[PDB]
Design a protein around this nucleic acid. Structure first.
Ligand code: K
Ligand code: K
Ligand code: K
Ligand code: MG
Ligand code: MG
Ligand code: MG
Ligand code: MG
Ligand code: MG
Length: 52
RNA sequence: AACAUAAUUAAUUUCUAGACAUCCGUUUAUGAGAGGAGAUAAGUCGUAACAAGGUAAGCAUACUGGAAAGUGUGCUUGGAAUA
């Protein structure tokens, strides 16, 4: 899932609310939170920020 | 080359990338050298035309000649024509 979102930002394409939802749901470790925090930041600064 | 994301306010992105470089030609300038026309203006050689200009003149054309010009053939009068 990380790769999918990264490609979208590289191509300046909108990311789905379902995509960010799947990431947060499947957090399984303390380290994963740090990555999700970065992707929550990226989602906020993206065209579909309102749809969180 | 023209799709793909997204969508419980709604929008994002694509909506391209080469090759428009030479031209085939076309004008003008330059002019080795070879000619023409005109004027300069004392000359040279002849006297072709104007008088029946001393072989009437001229036209087209041909040949010939230092040069005007000469000769032929048909045509014209812008000549003459009684012995
Ligand atoms: K004569
Ligand atoms: K004479
Ligand atoms: K005469
Ligand atoms: Mg005579
Ligand atoms: Mg004579
Ligand atoms: Mg003649
Ligand atoms: Mg003769
Ligand atoms: Mg003779």
């Amino acid at each position: 899932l990380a790769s999918l979102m990264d490609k979208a930002y590289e191509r300046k394409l909108p990311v789905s609310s379902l995509s960010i939802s799947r990431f947060v749901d499947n957090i399984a470790s303390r380290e994963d939170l740090d990555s999700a925090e970065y992707y929550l930041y990226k989602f906020r600064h993206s065209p579909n920020c309102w749809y969180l």
